[PDB]
Amino acid sequence: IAGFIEGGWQGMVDGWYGYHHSNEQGSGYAADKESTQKAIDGITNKINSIIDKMNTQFEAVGREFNNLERRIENLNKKMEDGFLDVWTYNAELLVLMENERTLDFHDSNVKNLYEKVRLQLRDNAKELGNGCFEFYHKCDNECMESVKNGTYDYPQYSEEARLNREEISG
Amino acid sequence: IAGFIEGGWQGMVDGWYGYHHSNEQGSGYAADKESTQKAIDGITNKINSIIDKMNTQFEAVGREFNNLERRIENLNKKMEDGFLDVWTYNAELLVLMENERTLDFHDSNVKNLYEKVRLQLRDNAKELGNGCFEFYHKCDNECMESVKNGTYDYPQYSEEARLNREEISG
Amino acid sequence: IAGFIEGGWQGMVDGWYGYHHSNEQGSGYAADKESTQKAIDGITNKINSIIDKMNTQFEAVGREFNNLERRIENLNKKMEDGFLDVWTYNAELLVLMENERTLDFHDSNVKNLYEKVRLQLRDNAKELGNGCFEFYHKCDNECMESVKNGTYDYPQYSEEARLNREEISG
Amino acid sequence: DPGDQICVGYHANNSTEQVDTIMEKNITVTHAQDILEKTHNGKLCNLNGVKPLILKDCSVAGWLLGNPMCDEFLNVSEWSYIVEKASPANGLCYPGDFNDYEELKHLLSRINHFEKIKIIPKSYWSNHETSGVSSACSYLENPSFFRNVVWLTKKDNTYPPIKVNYTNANQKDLLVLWGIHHPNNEAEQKMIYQNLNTYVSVGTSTLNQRLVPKIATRSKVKGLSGRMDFFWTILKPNDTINFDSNGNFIAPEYAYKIVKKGDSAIMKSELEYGNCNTKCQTPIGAINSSMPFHNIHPLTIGECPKYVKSNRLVLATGLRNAP
Amino acid sequence: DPGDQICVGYHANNSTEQVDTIMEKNITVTHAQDILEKTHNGKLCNLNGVKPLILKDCSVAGWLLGNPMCDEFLNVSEWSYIVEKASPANGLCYPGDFNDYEELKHLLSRINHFEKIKIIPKSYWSNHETSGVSSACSYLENPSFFRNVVWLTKKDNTYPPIKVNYTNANQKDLLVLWGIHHPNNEAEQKMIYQNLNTYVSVGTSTLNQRLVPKIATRSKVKGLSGRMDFFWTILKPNDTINFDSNGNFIAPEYAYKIVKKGDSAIMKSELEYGNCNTKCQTPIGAINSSMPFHNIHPLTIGECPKYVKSNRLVLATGLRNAP
Amino acid sequence: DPGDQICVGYHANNSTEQVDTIMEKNITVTHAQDILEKTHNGKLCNLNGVKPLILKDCSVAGWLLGNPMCDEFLNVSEWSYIVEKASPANGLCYPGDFNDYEELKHLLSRINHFEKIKIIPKSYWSNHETSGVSSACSYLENPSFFRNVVWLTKKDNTYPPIKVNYTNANQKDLLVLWGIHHPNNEAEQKMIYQNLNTYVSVGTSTLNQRLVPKIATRSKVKGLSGRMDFFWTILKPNDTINFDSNGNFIAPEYAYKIVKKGDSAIMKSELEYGNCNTKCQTPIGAINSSMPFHNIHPLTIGECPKYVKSNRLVLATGLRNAP
Ligand SMILES: CC(=O)N[C@@H]1[C@@H](O)[C@H](O[C@@H]2O[C@H](CO[C@]3(C(=O)O)C[C@H](O)[C@@H](NC(C)=O)[C@H]([C@H](O)[C@H](O)CO)O3)[C@H](O)[C@H](O)[C@H]2O)[C@@H](CO)O[C@H]1O
Ligand SMILES: CC(=O)N[C@@H]1[C@@H](O)[C@H](O[C@@H]2O[C@H](CO[C@]3(C(=O)O)C[C@H](O)[C@@H](NC(C)=O)[C@H]([C@H](O)[C@H](O)CO)O3)[C@H](O)[C@H](O)[C@H]2O)[C@@H](CO)O[C@H]1O
Ligand SMILES: CC(=O)N[C@@H]1[C@@H](O)[C@H](O[C@@H]2O[C@H](CO[C@]3(C(=O)O)C[C@H](O)[C@@H](NC(C)=O)[C@H]([C@H](O)[C@H](O)CO)O3)[C@H](O)[C@H](O)[C@H]2O)[C@@H](CO)O[C@H]1O
Ligand SMILES: *[C@@H]1O[C@H](CO)[C@@H](O)[C@H](O)[C@H]1NC(C)=O
Ligand SMILES: *[C@@H]1O[C@H](CO)[C@@H](O)[C@H](O)[C@H]1NC(C)=O
Ligand SMILES: *[C@@H]1O[C@H](CO)[C@@H](O)[C@H](O)[C@H]1NC(C)=O
Ligand SMILES: *[C@@H]1O[C@H](CO)[C@@H](O)[C@H](O)[C@H]1NC(C)=O
Ligand SMILES: *[C@@H]1O[C@H](CO)[C@@H](O)[C@H](O)[C@H]1NC(C)=O
Ligand SMILES: *[C@@H]1O[C@H](CO)[C@@H](O)[C@H](O)[C@H]1NC(C)=O
To answer: Which positions form S-S bridges (chains A, B, C) (predicted)?
Structure first.
């Protein structure tokens, strides 16, 4: 199996960012509630706030001119096109610019999540180079769930972990 | 005590990004001058440059029309509102967009600073998972100040550091 | 010699992001084709897409008014200046904003590349703190080129690497 | 030996949906939100409760004055907005010009409720003929005239000076329309009006107009070289309009009461009625949409999304979707 | 065993200040900069050294022609900008129209210095009465007239043809105003002017105007059915204006010299003078501000911040403030 | 002991090129792309195949009517755009006004091909003199007149009523111009036209114009107090224009056929011809440029880059260049 470094998981569904735990009592995916929700309240707010800054925007209205008011008929036309062209630019660019600020927001949220556990584990585990960690100790379906919600007692598993590390340099 | 991973320090005041050194001769906070100033010359320049791109902007002027110039009175009105609405959008959005480019600029400046020392120390210290480092050797109020201004002689403390590391796997 | 942490290399030319390999059979710079090209197809697309969102833009046209049409002559003038001023703002700001989204794109592409190898090597090498790695094993001009294109067999060099590591704590 | 593991990773799916970036196009993504409305019912609908005035083949001039080919519109009262065709065929049947026409249509775009009333009944013309009529303003084969204005001509063999007033005792504004006939020659003039050097003068608190016929040789339109030029104003409450003439007067019989003003419009569309409801109407069809943008037609009326000229506006929500 | 430590961390404080983001609102922050000015002194002030023309209850017409209820303004010379009320009460006391009024007010918005001069003294009218006067243009109970224009009427029992000129020998442009009276009937005409078929003709290098009275029955305004329509032009230096008339002429006595042009404006405000100074003035109050934006009123004059319709513009400077 | 190594690093060079950022200015960079065109050939060139109409020292009025000082332009047919100087000296040699002038120049900015034709040959005037002439419209010292319009005056000692028509049998629109003379006094009138109370009346399907001379005393321009006011319209195919007059008529001899419409313009420039080609022209010079922007002059014609008022627009491409 493999983490974020080589693609995404069709297996996880309860969220956008999450873990997979392979241990002795069982496998399975599990989303990180905190960061995922954080990416829902954010993207949503982004949407509504795009709509609302567009809630005020120019409104074209038709005006008739006669045969001897060609100069103002043409002024009127350049004016209403002008604003139409300005707001079409502002929308297409706002969307493009914030699309990019969105994909990067996902690409950073993942890496921050990887770093969240890499900081929690340190030498009690070995990072496999594929977005996965191999525990130097046994991690019951209770140490796994400890890591996920950020509640990981390091010294508790510290000893067992250390000994299994120098066995590998025995 | 604890680093950036769990909040910010009311104790530091001389800057935005900095360290706290806990050793044998004394504690205390100390800002990183280089990165902090770098974040002053930057944010300031951001401000002035927002003002200056707004230094050129539409100016509404009053015009009177009579009872039989309703079509151009209404054109004039839609035009002056139009530009007012366009520039109100450009400002509220410039502020929102650069507010975000500002908080992230802070959130990256910190992490780059953490990485600045993590690269300087490596195995001569153990990263505690909370934005702090524990030295494997003794760091006089002169090795601390060595780390801060980026002038850290690694081999000089290399030996003492190594020996204290395998004592922990003795 | 030194990596990205202390400046850039006049020596590399075949690309924007790359490596230098110092081993037993020879030195020399070598760009990472994948990430560099990725930064060409990107920056280029950025350009063309700036032009194309400007491909639609207001066009000023001259209109004559007589001595008793000062009110609309002045309206016309404020209107054509208004749009000129709006599009000059949109361009100068689009350029400024995407200049910044460009330099950061380079500053991240490098760090992602450093992380690409740091993940590939792990304990089979020691990161020197300057954007360089020192192999704990011998890396023929074939293990180097293995690292670069992301094809690095870790267990193959695992053993030799491990033994040379505890010699340093012998 | 193999030990326990945890991984960090992200969502995928069978999502064909793409979005765009400044730097990269057609990025396959897991979730996208389209924010552009690209479809309309193609119909001219009611606007909320209220129903539009489809003028069909008449123009605002024709309707208001009463071109005989526009009798349908003789008693309209309340509308939501006006649809007028691009080039309607029935405007001024008797060739001529409508003074400050556009400024009137613009004024109509702020009115949605008329009440036609009677200010000068034909009965008043006890010393003039009110049966002036033309083949250009002809109804069923037989020559007729505008339904709301009267071609006063000579009775027996005199045209005694006219001096008639109407007082706006109502508490609404009043739209009044008159006109004047330009004869082809002095012979044709006296055959119709007897008198030779003529004028039409209208007076209010604000208005102070003097009109004089222009005899001149013009090209034939609808067979005629004669011309009728029409005029309008707004008579404020408790104000009196005053007509004086000694020939060529086209008197108003009816005047339109302005009972309700309100935001409206005059749309230009070839379409007919559609018998449907909406809250957002464009000249080419109505909109039922929650979207924040649309791209069908800029000239909308009602609570609508914002018009942009885009073919596509789609926002990224999910993550890049790695197949 | 516990060893020496270093940490990496960041600033906090007791900062309630928030800012906003596209993705996140009400972000508590350590330092913020507000860039929107939301307060004005609520007063109409001097603009730099110079003092404004508050027309009070007169209108530009009233002031220029000299409505008797506007004598205060008889000798203004230099201003910074003009404040005129929305609906001033004293414009044209004698009911009538001002020709190209708006184009004049617009011209005044480019002038800040007048010098009233005397081009045709009443003494010149050695064969006409210059005491035409009306109850509508009435001062202290007793009927009067516009201070700057003269109601020429018949002397003894003749109105001899008028043929008078004025040469602009000064090196500034000159604003001249005349007018014409529309009588109610031929009886009233000859009672005032003797002559029956009349004209007023004005001529310059550019102007070539012929005016003719319009007898017609109009509604009563201020008790009157008569009307006076006024007109203007600019007499360039070394050019001559030429009036010819045989009745109904309202002659100019005074003409305004345009000594200094300059950027100015005509503001619309109910406010009075405020006896204060400023460099930035809006119709509802002045601004003393270093801010780059403001939101009080779009119609400003002077070196001002840029108007936006925002309630709030505040920039983040410090960091997210973790309590 | 020293072992094998790999590094990660990036590009440098000897690149002085800088770019700008919101947060940081003058950032030395390895590669930059300038997107602003800041140079023009300073010349007025052909536009594609086609050559411009440089009116030089004439104005559109002068050219069209035929001010004698504008004979060069007597037979122009096809152009790309029109260059007219700011203040051309030769417009209306005989002092006067051109009615709806601007609306005509605006109409000309949609035309690029004229064909002058002859609708009323001088030969037609078999009972009037066609040699009216003035010192203001003077050619080589000797007094002349507009080449395209004829000063009809009295023959022997009568001016018999004129009643002439022209039918537009061609399948293009037709621009026709006439005029009218304002004499100084009744003596001068009859010396020229015999008849005393005169009119000019023009009629089409649409037009219905009556003109009347205005005798009035005006200032002297080019020594003269007389005036000639000119007028225009468009005669649609298979329509007839009809002139009637009994004095003061300035008859058209020639009428301009509108063979090709098309996007054009009237530019204002002091420059002369440049004998060169381009696809993008500004009033101060042409552009040969692949750039997406330019900053020379906003008033361009042809396929051009977009005008911005920037001094500098340069994009970053390469990386920060560490020396
Ligand atoms: C009233 C009458 O008997 N008129 C006869 C003329 O009509 C006729 O000349 C021909 O007139 C044609 C137009 O006739 C009308 C029309 O517009 O259809 C007939 C109307 O009844 C008449 N109405 C009034 C109020 O006068 C109307 C009017 O005179 C014109 O519109 C004035 O411009 O004209 C058409 O123009 C033919 O080309 C013309 O020859 C002559 C011929 O004998 O006899 C008249 O008695
Ligand atoms: C000059 C004189 O004796 N006029 C008497 C009329 O005034 C009077 O008719 C009444 O006039 C009223 C208005 O009177 C004035 C006015 O506007 O106040 C009085 C002015 O002196 C007079 N000025 C001039 C230069 O003529 C002026 C002028 O005639 C009108 O403005 C012309 O439109 O009128 C008011 O209109 C009453 O409703 C009216 O009955 C009659 C009655 O006997 O006698 C006149 O001698
Ligand atoms: C036709 C003739 O003999 N005219 C003599 C007058 O010209 C002359 O009065 C002087 O006229 C000067 C202008 O003379 C012209 C002109 O504009 O150059 C001469 C033209 O031939 C004449 N053309 C026509 C068609 O009439 C023209 C015209 O009368 C005016 O433009 C009408 O406004 O005038 C100049 O104005 C002098 O200031 C004036 O004194 C008198 C003097 O004896 O004799 C006339 O016979
Ligand atoms: C992006 O996808 C659309 C829809 O299939 C396609 O028409 C377009 O060509 C694609 N983009 C490119 C650069 O080909
Ligand atoms: C209407 O005309 C009559 C005379 O025909 C007149 O007595 C009456 O005063 C006029 N109405 C008004 C309001 O002047
Ligand atoms: C943000 O703070 C303002 C000021 O107290 C408050 O009115 C507003 O409701 C807050 N935002 C939200 C989403 O509640
Ligand atoms: C002013 O009028 C007199 C006659 O009243 C006349 O002699 C003089 O030439 C006129 N002034 C000008 C500049 O024409
Ligand atoms: C940036 O470089 C330009 C060009 O040499 C120079 O004029 C300008 O002063 C520089 N910027 C600053 C802030 O000095
Ligand atoms: C042109 O005038 C003649 C009389 O001079 C007339 O017979 C003819 O009908 C007129 N042309 C047109 C099209 O009316």
So the answer is: 139-143
Q: Would an 8 Å CB–CB cutoff place D202 in contact with chain E?
A: yes
Please answer yes or no on whether F319 and C106 come within 8 Å at the CB atom: yes
Burial of C38 (0-12, 13-18, 19+ CB in 10 A): middle
- For residues D218 and F129, what is the distance between their CA atoms, to the nearest angstrom? 26
Closest ligand 3 atom to the C-alpha of F184? 33
- Sort out which chain B residues have CB atoms less than 8 A from D107's CB and list them: 70
Mark yes or no for CB contact A42/E309 under 8 Å: no
Q: Which CATH number goes with the domain that contains B19?
A: 3.90.20.10
Q: What resolution, expressed in A, was reported for this entry?
A: 2.7
Domain with CATH 3.90.209.20 in chain E: 51-271
* Domains in chain C, number: 1
- Per the CB < 8 A criterion, the answer to whether D104 and D253 are in contact is no
Question: F103: which chain A residues are within 8 Å (Cβ-Cβ)?
Answer: 68-71
Distance from CA of A95 to the nearest CA of D (A): 6
Is residue F238 lining ligand 9, measured as CB closer than 6 Å?
A: no
Gap between the Cα atoms of B148 and B30, Å rounded: 9
Does the beta carbon of E223 sit less than 6 angstroms from any atom of ligand 2? yes
Instruction: Sort residue D309 into left (φ over 0), alpha (ψ -120 to 50) or beta.
Output: alpha
Q: Which chains touch C (3 or more CB pairs under 8 A)?
A: A, B, D, E, F
Assign residue B150 a region (left: φ > 0; alpha: ψ between -120 and 50; beta: otherwise): left
E203 → chain F, closest CA residue: F218
Looking from the CA of E104 toward its CB, the CA atoms found within 13 Å total: 21
Assign B90 to helix, strand or coil.
helix
- Distance between CA F290 and CA F34 in Å, rounded? 11
Q: Which CATH class is domain E1-50+272-323?
A: mainly beta
Domain encompassing residue A60: 1-170
The residues, any chain, with a CB within 8 Å of residue F42's CB and separated by 6 or more, are F271, F284, F285
By CA distance, what is C70's nearest residue in E? E103
User: What are E162's strand-pairing partners?
Assistant: E245
- Non-local (6+) Cβ contacts of D224 within 8 A are D94, D95, D134, D135, D136
Q: Which two tokens stand for residue C68?
A: 């008793």
> Is F235 within 8 Å of F258 (Cβ atoms)?
no
Residue F32: beta bridge partners? F316
The tokens of F307 are what? 């005008």
Q: Which CATH number fits domain D51-271: 2.70.50.60, 1.10.10.10, 3.30.420.130, 3.90.209.20?
A: 3.90.209.20
Spatial CB neighbours of E146, under 8 Å, sequence gap ≥ 6: E65, E66, E67, E68, E93, E94, E137, E250
How far apart are alpha carbons A130 and F12 in whole angstroms?
A: 32
Tokens representing residue D192 in the block: 């119709």
Query: In the PDB record, what is the listed experimental method?
Result: X-ray
Q: E167: CA distance to ligand 7 center in Å?
A: 9
Facing B56 at nearest CB: one of C75, C88, C97: C88
Give dist(CA F181, CA F199) in Å, integer.
10
Q: Determine which residue's CA is closest to atom 9 belonging to ligand 8.
A: F26
The owner of tokens 């009080």 is E296
Are F226 and F145 in contact, with CB atoms under 8 Å apart?
A: no
E225 Cα–ligand 2 center, Å = 10
Contact F276, F45 (CB under 8 A): yes
**Residue to test with chain E: of C69, C71, C89, most E Cβ within 10 A:** C71
C-beta E13 within 6 A of ligand 7: no
Q: Which residues pair with F153 in a beta bridge?
A: F129
CB neighbour class for F2 (10 Å; exposed up to 12, middle 13-18, buried from 19): exposed
E309, B88 Cβ separation under 8 angstroms: yes
Q: Where in chain D is the domain with CATH 2.10.77.10?
A: 1-50+272-323
Which residue owns the Cα nearest ligand 3 atom 3?
F191
